[PDB]
Design a protein around this ligand. Sequence first.
Ligand SMILES: [Ca+2]
Ligand SMILES: [Mg+2]
Ligand SMILES: [Mg+2]
Ligand SMILES: [Mg+2]
Ligand SMILES: [Mg+2]
Length: 341
Amino acid sequence: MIVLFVDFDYFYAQVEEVLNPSLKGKPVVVCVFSGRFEDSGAVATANYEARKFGVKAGIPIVEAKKILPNAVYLPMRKEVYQQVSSRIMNLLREYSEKIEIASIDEAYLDISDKVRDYREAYNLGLEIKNKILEKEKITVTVGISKNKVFAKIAADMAKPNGIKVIDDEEVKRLIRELDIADVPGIGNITAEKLKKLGINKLVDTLSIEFDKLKGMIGEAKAKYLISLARDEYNEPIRTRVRKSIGRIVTMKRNSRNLEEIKPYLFRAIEESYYKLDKRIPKAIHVVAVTEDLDIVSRGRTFPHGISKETAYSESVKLLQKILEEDERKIRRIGVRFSKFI
DNA sequence: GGGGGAAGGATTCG
DNA sequence: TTTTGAATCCTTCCCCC
Ligand SMILES: [Ca+2]
Ligand SMILES: [Mg+2]
Ligand SMILES: [Mg+2]
Ligand SMILES: [Mg+2]
Ligand SMILES: [Mg+2]
């Protein structure tokens, strides 16, 4: 199996440079203004110029500005990015029927029927980079290898505007030298729990008792790692189907007065139904984020698809259930639909 | 014992 | 003034064979 991976570079920012070239070279930060107060909200992503000086995904727009008072600040235009993306993705489908769109900016291509070796792949990666650079003027990073994981790993080692290949040999190496927290799907909480066991590389998972690992990071993640450690990882590139759609919004002011929260819940639903677009959900969850930033949600499954009228009524019940079962005030309120027919 | 599914906190990645 | 927001992942609880 041969996997070619495409990761668009600093995507939201880049699309913004493409829409306004007079931005190339300058620091650009794509934000998500929450609305509570002047510049309240986080940073979605910034081009590399802005990353150098410490501005990056996650930090507050408030901090961001103290550091780069002149960097160009722009509101996240998700819609636009999503359309530009789809176009890019299509260009990809012209290189393999087996395509796994993973995110608005990542895609996996099983090209084990279009090349015979990594060289022929490399040349394909180059072809793909340039074809995307012409058509959409967007630079990307390619990662090629034996399975979706390492190909991604490859691409991280190269971005931006790069292209790398990890041969079955470098895999044996990485399995031995690569920091485990750098392995896809392994976040901070699991990275930590792994260092707390002395496990720092993929290999290390092989020298530990299984029921021990499983008890610390769960059965699924336990198996997932062991399988990589053994280079026994092969997972088909499959069409990924979104399994749930939702929306959650930050209220102007914390509260727990049912009638004050409703309007938001309802807008959250409307925006969610628009997004559902012909998909009929059989499950609804109302999600609340309390003042201390904790998350509390209550859902319910129906033996039939849910109409917008039903969502409205059921969501209020679930919201009440929340207020009853928790005393904290709500900061952000939202809804989530799933289990489509 | 375990199928199978419903719920809700947990974790990941932005 | 904090820390936006979207979606799956994991785990437990529960009914019934
Ligand atoms: Ca990217
Ligand atoms: Mg991404
Ligand atoms: Mg990590
Ligand atoms: Mg909690
Ligand atoms: Mg529970």
